[PDB]
Amino acid sequence: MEKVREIVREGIRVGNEDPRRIIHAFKVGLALVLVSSFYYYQPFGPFTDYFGINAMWAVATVVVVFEFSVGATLGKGLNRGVATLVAGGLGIGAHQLARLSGATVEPILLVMLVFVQAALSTFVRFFPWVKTKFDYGILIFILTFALISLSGFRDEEIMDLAESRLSTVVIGGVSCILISIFVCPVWAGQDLHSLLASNFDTLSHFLQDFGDEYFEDYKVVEKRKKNLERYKSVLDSKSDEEALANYAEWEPPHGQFRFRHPWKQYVAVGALLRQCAYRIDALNSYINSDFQIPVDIKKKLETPLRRMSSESGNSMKEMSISLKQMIKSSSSDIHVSNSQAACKSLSTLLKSGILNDVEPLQMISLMTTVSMLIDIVNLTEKISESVHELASAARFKNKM
Amino acid sequence: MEKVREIVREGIRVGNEDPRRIIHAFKVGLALVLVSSFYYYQPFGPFTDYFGINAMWAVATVVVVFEFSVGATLGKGLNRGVATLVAGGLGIGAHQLARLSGATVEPILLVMLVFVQAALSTFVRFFPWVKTKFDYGILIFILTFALISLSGFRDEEIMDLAESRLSTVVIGGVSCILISIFVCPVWAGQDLHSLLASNFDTLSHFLQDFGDEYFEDYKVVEKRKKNLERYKSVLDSKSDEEALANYAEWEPPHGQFRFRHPWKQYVAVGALLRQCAYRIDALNSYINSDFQIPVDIKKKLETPLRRMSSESGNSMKEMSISLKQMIKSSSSDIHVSNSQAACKSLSTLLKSGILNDVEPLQMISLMTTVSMLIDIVNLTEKISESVHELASAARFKNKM
Ligand SMILES: [Al+3]
Ligand SMILES: [Al+3]
């Protein structure tokens, strides 16, 4: 009874985190009902020959092929389709040759050709190009060749069997793709777009909050969560960006997104934000340490550090705003030039010799923080140029 | 002809990088030949009822289940086995109930139970626990229930069909696992162990080379590769560590490794090395910059920075040596205490005021480098304690 309560509240939070998981769970069952009723009630005619010979394979296709995104099922469906076509042609050819050879060497020769192909294709599944794009196609290539060659049929039956396999894969895959595209779509390109703009938002949050909280019992643990967990969620999402980009390359043009859309540029901007998260991680550790400088030693540098941190935070905020609405923007340029002027003001402040009355270990912590902020300012200048190049590549609208 | 040359040399380098890919490609074809000859020649008797009714499903199982590691195929095989057992029992039960209800409502009630289960299981595939361990088991659960419920057989035939499905999954999976375990094994626990010791080695390489090359046309690009690519290979391997740990939790005890072996501690030590790679990344950027300090300004600090960097490099080297031979070691403690004494010597050197005749922008770069080295020294102290706790958890041998 107790673990029943735990699993129903776990289901409650999994559904509450994204409700499109509930709609995807209904779309899978709808595709199963649609495919099974097509092969049972047989609408236009009582099809025979290869049409209604096998119908468990259509349900196998729909269960395997359906996926949460649109590019995920389109990738699985197109891989399964072309692999079944090619391996079906090679399977009919293998049965022709092995029948032509002999009558008792025929199971021997067929199992040797299956050994050779499997070995050949299992080695090709370690190539990096085939690994990132078409690994499932090579698996279905092995599978379909070994189904057709190692069956116990003959020169007509094999032909019917190959056609049946090809036709039931096409019907199951097309039913999956039409329900995926036309009911409630979950585009992976929109999820990559939203994940990028959310990452910009969390970094802007830390920069403004560092501009305040650098110069100050459960509230300490609350702000500990609010600082640490956000940029630590940025660092652990290299893989999510990689996966959504591989899916979003498969999708058709929808809405605002053009047919050609630069997803590799999205992963490049994600990598630059991860470098900013490295520097933000270093700052956080120093902030949370126990060895803290006396506060007025920071208060003699409190002006241009506040200006640098706040203006780079506003630059990240304006870039996230311009990516959420897909426009070309020029607010980030003004907020970047202000941080550049603040860095030059700090460089003229440091020659004034205001740090000649300070212990050098405090100077170690102080010059670490100044170096981290200068690095983050130059990094946000790079991300501003890169987001501008992404905004011209995707042909964002020119409204502003 | 030209792309043929390109693909054969790509195959040459893919085989040369790891030759166990060639042996795995032979093991897959051997499992296909073994399974197909078992179902064709039918050794002990001409089995009937459920034994030789279906034999394409054994080859489907062997193609899908076989994987490069040992824990990978053991995970796929055990997931497929228990999912086929449970969904077979529920499928026979569903056909019993739907036959008991009516005679014309029976296809309607069967397709509604398939809709409910698919919806129920596709929602559970978003849980994080089920996602990291048993996602393929839930997929085979959907598949086997929908094969048994949506067939056109009746009260005896269904029973034979369920048993046949269960028996051919067990035979294909056991043939895969015995060839995987008993021919040439590729253990994923040994690959995680070797990947950890290699990561320690690349970090030790950078620390010694930084101790030399901090104080100095294609040779510049050569050492650019030799510095940059190593620690950048450390940073991009969070996922590899995660995947090999999930596989290595499935494996039986082999050789030196005990039945209980702490793979989560391996991923914890990998995370601490990734923090060291963050700090090493910051140092590299400064080293490669164009704004360089005049060299004698570094040469007045050249002594304890050399001692700190070299002793932490020797500590990483001794930890990698002790992890390659699986012993408990005490060389890392002496090499850590030397770096601690060097840090205190630097702290007494900085109070002497040798940095009062230097421009403060040069002091910014200098105090950045000193802060990075102090952070790396304290980090290697943490990794030394954590590798000691891993070395007692796994009960390494006490030879030294
Ligand atoms: Al015909
Ligand atoms: Al019987």
Curated annotation (Swiss-Prot), chains A, B:
Segments crossing the lipid bilayer: 28-48, 51-71, 104-124, 133-153, 169-189
Protein induction: Up-regulated by aluminum. Small induction by erbium (Er) and low pH stress, but no induction by cadmium, copper, lanthanum or sodium.
Keywords: Cell membrane, Ion channel, Ion transport, Membrane, Phosphoprotein, Transmembrane, Transmembrane helix, Transport
Tissue-wise expression: Expressed in roots, but not in shoots. Detected in the root apex in absence of aluminum stress and in root apices, the stele and endodermis of the elongating zone of primary and lateral roots after aluminum stress. Not expressed in cortical and epidermal cells.
Description of the deletion phenotype: No visible phenotype when grown under normal conditions. Lack of aluminum-activated malate release and shorter roots when submitted to aluminum stress.
GO cellular component terms, semicolon-separated: plasma membrane
Record GO biological process: malate transmembrane transport; monoatomic ion transmembrane transport; response to aluminum ion
Modification(s) after translation: Phosphorylated. A reversible phosphorylation is required for activation.
Primary residence: membrane
Modified residues (Phosphothreonine): 380
Function: Malate transporter critical for aluminum tolerance. The STOP1 transcription factor is required for ALMT1 expression.
Name under which the protein is recorded: Aluminum-activated malate transporter 1
Species of origin: Arabidopsis thaliana (Mouse-ear cress)
Residues included from the entire protein: 1 to 405 of 493
